[PDB]
Amino acid sequence: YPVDLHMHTVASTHAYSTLSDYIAQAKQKGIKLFAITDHGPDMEDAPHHWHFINMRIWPRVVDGVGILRGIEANIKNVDGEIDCSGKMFDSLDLIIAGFHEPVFAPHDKATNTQAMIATIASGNVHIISHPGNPKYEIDVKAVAEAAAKHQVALEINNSSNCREVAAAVRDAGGWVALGSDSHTAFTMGEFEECLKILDAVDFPPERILNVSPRRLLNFLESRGMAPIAEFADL
Amino acid sequence: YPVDLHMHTVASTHAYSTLSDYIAQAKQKGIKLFAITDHGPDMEDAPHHWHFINMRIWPRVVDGVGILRGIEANIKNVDGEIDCSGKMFDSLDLIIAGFHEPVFAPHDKATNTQAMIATIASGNVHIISHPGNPKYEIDVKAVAEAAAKHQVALEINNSSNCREVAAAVRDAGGWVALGSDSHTAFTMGEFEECLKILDAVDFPPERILNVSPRRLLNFLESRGMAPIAEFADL
Amino acid sequence: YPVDLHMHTVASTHAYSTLSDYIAQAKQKGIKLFAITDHGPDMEDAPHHWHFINMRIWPRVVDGVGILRGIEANIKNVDGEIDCSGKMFDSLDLIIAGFHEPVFAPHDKATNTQAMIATIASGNVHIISHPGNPKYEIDVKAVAEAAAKHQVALEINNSSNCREVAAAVRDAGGWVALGSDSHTAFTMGEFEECLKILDAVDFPPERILNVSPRRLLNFLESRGMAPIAEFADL
Ligand SMILES: [Zn+2]
Ligand SMILES: [Zn+2]
Ligand SMILES: [Zn+2]
Ligand SMILES: [Zn+2]
Ligand SMILES: [Zn+2]
Ligand SMILES: [Zn+2]
Ligand SMILES: [Zn+2]
Ligand SMILES: [Zn+2]
Ligand SMILES: [Zn+2]
């Protein structure tokens, strides 16, 4: 799969690669399109919000590889709010969101569920990262269904309840997104384990965002993103 | 122009390239001499002051490219003080200074003007970055004149009232410095827009610091910098 | 010597290279094994503790170079405690510890001495960095002896009382470790000055850890480290 949608740079000290490391690795591993999704600013060991605002300066294409500007936002509360400002939204192409302890501590199932669904229903998010995380128990079918209705993808995460999530998305009719959640560029694009989960449930290839750059970019346009001309040839 | 004097590294999370990225880009784009000028420590999302003190360890030359140790200091007050310590000064070659909100909020014209002039007159600065910034209204002619008298260059900034600044420096007789104010290495040395401003006013090429490494280094020696032997051949 | 055991990345703003810069430099300079030892979290301008915990994701080998996960911990008190947690210990291979001002201010000789000896006796440390630092006066022979008894190496530090330390380790019978204490990858593996100190005292080559990867890794196994299979061929 020549698209990877979820990775981290030194903007967090618990990651260790830069933008240039990811471009170089993509070139080496035949990746044509990727997104940098640093942790949102309310998280501990996450960058300043300006880190997201100033991504508007990034080149679109380097050595043939397209680059998407993203964030892995933190879900803050049962209202589905995330630590992403309007100014931040304007600079970004890809909005991923998910549960991280220091921002949202695992609560009762029903709380986690309502907070995830509200985030999905908000219209402000493209992808929920690692919803299969055992630390945050949720009603999977209810989430998948909400995700299908609001056209949000549920992540199947390599770094990483994922079979349940995958079969759920299969039946609800939604999108699955694949993400390495790389904290170094060495695991970029590495989905072997994700792939097994999907095979074990016979997931339809037609609903994997990562199959091609164009399929992923079509999805972002369906969600309201103005087309990115520099990406036409991908 | 084979010299670029103003750029930023990951030491701020709103920048995204390292020292090694800038060296590699310079090599690719035919740049023979550059300066890293991270934001001064009083600014938000800026490094620890040790970041400037420890630049004394940097190699002078890599792959034929010379490397200047610098800072983009923040002007703090009407007295022309900047967030650069004596220990910091001893490690550095190039001192740039300018107005940044979190440290100095735009005030009345007269305030901005006196603070800029005092910074220029202090003797502690080589270059005022983006003085043409509309956010900080100033008496241009008075600044240019002060800059000519104190032998400080006024920046014409690519990242970016610049025609007014340029014609002013033209008539006052001072130096202009060109800076990409790159926050990634991809725009290093990129002055196309600066160049247009200068052409529109018929600026004398003889007063552009960036024409050659030697011209820039002669200027730093005129301001009191002991000569840098590793740079002789540039 | 094809092993360097002490260097720093951008996780501190007073360093300027990444993991990928160090791998690239090692390849260029014929280094087969190195360790990244960022400053411990209690220090100023040091990373979040997660920076050490998440090193468990690092690849073992890149371009033929083996990579050790380490920390330069800070000695906190006369009890020999360091700013390294149990969770942090589990992710790491190499534990270096030493005196740094903001965490432990130089005290009377006897204090520095007891704090260093206690750190050595704790069993939690492999190497004391720059014990020859004049800022922290110590009873050298007592330290070396303790180091020999507890099988801890004393660093002879290039970045840098080192002749006294070296002759002391010579007579006490302990290990010496060589470290560049690089804050950029450009000085990686650079021990010329260390080497002179050792020659001046006729130090036995048999007791220099850095002679070969296997000798260094044998020492870590003697201290209780489960063997690292990916390193067999080094
Ligand atoms: Zn993370
Ligand atoms: Zn996450
Ligand atoms: Zn993530
Ligand atoms: Zn900036
Ligand atoms: Zn600026
Ligand atoms: Zn700047
Ligand atoms: Zn240091
Ligand atoms: Zn140290
Ligand atoms: Zn060190």
UniProtKB/Swiss-Prot annotation, chains A, B, C:
Zn(2+) 2 binds at residues 14, 39, 183. Keywords: Hydrolase, Metal-binding, Zinc. It comes from the Bacteria. This is Probable phosphatase YcdX. Binds 3 Zn(2+) ions per subunit. SUPFAM superfamilies: PHP domain-like. Hydrolyzes p-nitrophenyl phosphate (pNPP) in vitro. Involved in the swarming motility process. Zn(2+) 1 binds at residues 6, 8, 72, 181. GO terms for molecular function: identical protein binding; phosphatase activity; phosphoric ester hydrolase activity; zinc ion binding. Zn(2+) 3 binds at residues 72, 100, 130. The keyword Repeat does not apply. It holds the Pfam family PHP. Activity is stimulated by YcdY. Its EC number is 3.1.3.-. Belongs to the PHP family. SMART domains: POLIIIAc. GO terms for cellular component: cytosol. Disruption phenotype: Mutants show no swarming ability. Its cofactor is Zn(2+). It comes from Escherichia coli (strain K12). InterPro entries: Phosphatase_YcdX_put, PHP_dom, PHP_phosphatase, Pol/His_phosphatase_N, Pol/histidinol_Pase-like. It is an enzyme of class 3 (hydrolase). The keyword Metal-binding applies. Homotrimer. Interacts with YcdY. GO terms for biological process: bacterial-type flagellum-dependent swarming motility.
